[PDB]
Amino acid sequence: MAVELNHTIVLVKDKDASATFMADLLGLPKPKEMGPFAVLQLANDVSIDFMDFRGEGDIVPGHCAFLISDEEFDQIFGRIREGGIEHWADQYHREPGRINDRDGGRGVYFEDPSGHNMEIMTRPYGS
């Protein structure tokens, strides 16, 4: 038996800005447009479907975390540095300009254009 998470919606101020930011940074294909969504496809058969928030007022920041290889971490963190992207070792953003070494891996937090708390890491939690 195998119940998979296939997609989840992330509400943002500008779906194209957030989805393209994430695809460019993570080195993924250009988001595909599907109805009101900018669809960001991840490798494990799941997508983040970015959608413009049509309520009021501020976005409540969510959290998405991405598991990547060591080689991918080097390239993606390289884009964080080269692009001047704010980043932090910790989820509460008190440790700017550092990465963490949780689980003997590497991890770092950054935000999408709407302020969601994004995270990349090379080892799963507790591994």
Comparing CB distances to a second copy, the nearer of 6 and 84 is: 6
Regarding 30 and contact with a second copy (CB under 8 A), the answer is no
Which of 26, 64, 65, 85: binder of Fe ion (CB under 5 A)?
65
Q: Which stretch binds a second copy (CB under 8 A): 13-21, 53-61, 80-88, 95-103?
A: 53-61
Least distance from a second copy to the Cβ atom of residue 84, Å: 21
Tokens 């294909």 identify what position? 29
Angle between helices 15-26 and 70-82 (to 10 degrees): 120
Regarding 66 and contact with a second copy (CB under 8 A), the answer is yes
Burial category of 70 from C-beta neighbours within 10 Å (exposed 0-12, middle 13-18, buried 19 and up): exposed
Q: How far apart are CA 102 and CA 119, in angstroms?
A: 12
Q: How far apart are CA 115 and CA 83, in angstroms?
A: 17
Between the CA of residue 107 and those of 62, 104, 117, what are the distances in Å? 18, 10, 13
Comparing CB distances to Fe ion, the nearer of 84 and 127 is: 127
- Contact set with a second copy (CB under 8 A): 1-9, 11, 26-28, 34, 42-46, 48-49, 53, 55-56, 60, 62-69, 72, 75-76, 121, 124-125
